[PDB]
Amino acid sequence: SKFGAISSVLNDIFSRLDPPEAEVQIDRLITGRLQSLQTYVTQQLIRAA
Amino acid sequence: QCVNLTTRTQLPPAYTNSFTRGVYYPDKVFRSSVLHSTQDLFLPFFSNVTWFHVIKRFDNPVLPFNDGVYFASIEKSNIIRGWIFGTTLDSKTQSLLIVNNATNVVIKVCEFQFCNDPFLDMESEFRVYSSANNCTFEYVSQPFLMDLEGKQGNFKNLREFVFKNIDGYFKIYSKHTPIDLPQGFSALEPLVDLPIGINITRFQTLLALHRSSSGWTAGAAAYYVGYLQPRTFLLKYNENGTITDAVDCAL
Amino acid sequence: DPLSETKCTLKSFTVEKGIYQTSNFRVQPTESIVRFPNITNLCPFDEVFNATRFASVYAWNRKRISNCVADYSVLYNLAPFFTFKCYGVSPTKLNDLCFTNVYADSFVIRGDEVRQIAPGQTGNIADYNYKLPDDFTGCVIAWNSNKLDSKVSGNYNYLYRLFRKSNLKPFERDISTEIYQAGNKPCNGVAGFNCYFPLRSYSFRPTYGVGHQPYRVVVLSFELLHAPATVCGPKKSTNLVKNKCVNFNFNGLKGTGVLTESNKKFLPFQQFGRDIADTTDAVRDPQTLEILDITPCSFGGVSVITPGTNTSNQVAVLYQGVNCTEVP
Amino acid sequence: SNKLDSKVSGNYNYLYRLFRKSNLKPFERDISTEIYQAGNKPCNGVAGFNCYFPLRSYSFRPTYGVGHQPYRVVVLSFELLHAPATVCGPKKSTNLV
Numbered sequence A: 001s002k003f004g005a006i007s008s009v010l011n012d013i014f015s016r017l018d019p020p021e022a023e024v025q026i027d028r029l030i031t032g033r034l035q036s037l038q039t040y041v042t043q044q045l046i047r048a049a
Numbered sequence B: 001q002c003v004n005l006t007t008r009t010q011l012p013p014a015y016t017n018s019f020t021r022g023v024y025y026p027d028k029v030f031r032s033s034v035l036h037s038t039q040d041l042f043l044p045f046f047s048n049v050t051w052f053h054v055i056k057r058f059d060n061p062v063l064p065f066n067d068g069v070y071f072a073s074i075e076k077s078n079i080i081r082g083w084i085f086g087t088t089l090d091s092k093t094q095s096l097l098i099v100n101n102a103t104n105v106v107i108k109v110c111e112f113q114f115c116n117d118p119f120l121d122m123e124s125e126f127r128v129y130s131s132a133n134n135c136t137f138e139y140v141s142q143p144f145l146m147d148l149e150g151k152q153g154n155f156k157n158l159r160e161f162v163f164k165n166i167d168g169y170f171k172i173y174s175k176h177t178p179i180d181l182p183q184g185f186s187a188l189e190p191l192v193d194l195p196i197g198i199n200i201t202r203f204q205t206l207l208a209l210h211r212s213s214s215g216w217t218a219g220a221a222a223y224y225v226g227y228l229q230p231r232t233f234l235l236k237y238n239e240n241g242t243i244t245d246a247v248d249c250a251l
Numbered sequence C: 001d002p003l004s005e006t007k008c009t010l011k012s013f014t015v016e017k018g019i020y021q022t023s024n025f026r027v028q029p030t031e032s033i034v035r036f037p038n039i040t041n042l043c044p045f046d047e048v049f050n051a052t053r054f055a056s057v058y059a060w061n062r063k064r065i066s067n068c069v070a071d072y073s074v075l076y077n078l079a080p081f082f083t084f085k086c087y088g089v090s091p092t093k094l095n096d097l098c099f100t101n102v103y104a105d106s107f108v109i110r111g112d113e114v115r116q117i118a119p120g121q122t123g124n125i126a127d128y129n130y131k132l133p134d135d136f137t138g139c140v141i142a143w144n145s146n147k148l149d150s151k152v153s154g155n156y157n158y159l160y161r162l163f164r165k166s167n168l169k170p171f172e173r174d175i176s177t178e179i180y181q182a183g184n185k186p187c188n189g190v191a192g193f194n195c196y197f198p199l200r201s202y203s204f205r206p207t208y209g210v211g212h213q214p215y216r217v218v219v220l221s222f223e224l225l226h227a228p229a230t231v232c233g234p235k236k237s238t239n240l241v242k243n244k245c246v247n248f249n250f251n252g253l254k255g256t257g258v259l260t261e262s263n264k265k266f267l268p269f270q271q272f273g274r275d276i277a278d279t280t281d282a283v284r285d286p287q288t289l290e291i292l293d294i295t296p297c298s299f300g301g302v303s304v305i306t307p308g309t310n311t312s313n314q315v316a317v318l319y320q321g322v323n324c325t326e327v328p
Numbered sequence D: 001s002n003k004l005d006s007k008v009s010g011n012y013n014y015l016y017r018l019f020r021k022s023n024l025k026p027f028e029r030d031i032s033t034e035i036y037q038a039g040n041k042p043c044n045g046v047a048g049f050n051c052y053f054p055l056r057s058y059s060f061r062p063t064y065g066v067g068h069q070p071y072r073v074v075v076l077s078f079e080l081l082h083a084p085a086t087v088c089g090p091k092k093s094t095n096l097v
Helices: A010-016 A019-048 C002-010
Strands: B015-018 B035-042 B047-054 B069-075 B082-086 B095-099 B106-114 B129-133 B157-166 B169-174 B189-194 B202-205 B221-226 B229-237 B243-248 C018-026 C032-034 C061-065 C101-109 C139-144 C155-161 C199-202 C215-223 C246-249 C254-261 C280-284 C291-295 C299-306 C316-320 D015-017 D055-057
Touching: A010 A019, A010 C254, B015 B221, B082 B106, B106 B189, C002 C018, C002 C299
Parallel strands: C032 C246
Antiparallel strands: B015 B047, B035 B229, B047 B221, B069 B157, B069 B221, B082 B095, B082 B202, B095 B106, B106 B129, B157 B169, B169 B189, B229 B243, C018 C299, C061 C101, C101 C215, C139 C215, C155 C199, C246 C254, C254 C291, C280 C291, C299 C316, D015 D055
């Protein structure tokens, strides 16, 4: 999933969009992917209990 | 040419039910042994498809292209020789023309003056169209050989095509299998993609004439035309990378 | 030292007895695979450049270039051309680009008319015969015709228009012989009072001055629409490596991994495909028909088993998910 | 500078480079007089077959339009928190508290 970014592939973002626009889009993906992993750790801690 | 023959008369809008068929490969991507979800223009399962026939009547009315076309023909000698797409179907604009000579399919987009009911003898245009000019586009398919003579046995030619125009991109999905109703499920494959870029609101079909004005006799064939809607199906991919099943998200 | 890796991950100089996960072993790429499809189905670009005949300034003939491969590399790497100048793109940069529509014309001009062909140019020629539009995205290339288009004492077989009743737009072919009328005296198809004779024959000869000499000008008009590009230029590729960690550079695909023989069937209209992850697991060769299975380069977790630094510095490295044969 | 730096017949004293073997990095001046060499034909320090002279002259003239109107470009590059700051506007100062 794109997490709001123009695309879900980083190579396309960096290889096409300009540096100032690429960094923004890459940040949207990284930000969301950290949230998805954040939710994963939260659920594991619940199941661990 | 300008006079209607015995086969042209007012007729009732007969229809049938297409249950499984009308699924095609949505993209060129490869997938195997997975469950894929996609939303595109598909033929709804358990829909109503308008039924046509050719033999004391001939069905080639002007059919809106708005929602797309799912064409399925049951034939032996390959009666239907092609299709005619365009808006006004006259010389005021350019129209797409598909003619099958049983050697190499000829596809040309040009300014044509179309009659009411185009026919093919060898091909004769007119009857199809009187004049042509002012066009830069022409296309041809790969060489092949097909028999237009009458055949015996069951109906061994089932040609199910999907015709759509996406942002000016005209794509043709093609499937051919042996078999007044089709049955079974198989996924159509891509064949022709032409960036034509014209507005097609209506379409017709071509007939193959046989004889030993009204002297020419129409062939014996049956077919029907469906329409596409933006529905989500779940495609079942097997180990070989083909679609063995499809599930309609909302049915 | 893997002992120090434990100190940096823990952000401390005292490592207590225990096993700690530090980094992840991975194989880095060595070579780089660059693949480009074949240049086959080359396109007749010699119908202008190497053409025997030619046309006047207003008689310029155009050759449609569409759905074909136009190879200019031989010419740009050679460039036996009088003058090549244009706006917005360098002509040497036109051989790596894919464009939807392409047009290449042929006409000859006088040496003093070289400046008369430019985007948005004006003058006795640009305005009254042929000129490039302001939005022209292509490039124009002159060539010295002294050995071909010329003729002894001159070339009188082709004429050029000095005047025109109105300003002609760019990319317009007017072969009209109409006589220019300056005043209110009707010209009656011939020159006379308040009338000028616009048609003039070419003086082209190899022995005259640089001012007037035959120079073949081929204006390449390129157009990129929303439709796919039907005309691409040539590009050079490299070999293909297998069973080695390398970077992937393809026509529509880029990535990193190893290539192996693929047992999966593919369609003739597909190049590459994706796995459950929407990440490409396979690709088709652009030049030849074959499919190779894309696998990620070898990697594994790295854990350090060491006692307390206050006891001993002995180190033991555990590679998880990696057999001893693949550790090197 | 169209009022000053232009000329009726044009001022070619100022020049520019249309050709280079690669992209010129930022904040780098190229004084190289080497003739651009496209092919293997040695240029011998002059333009010719497979040889082109990169440096060219501006079009500055008072009569023509913007494209022929010279502009005086001065680009300022500030070093911020890269070292003690010795420069800034007429800002006052007060006593410590």
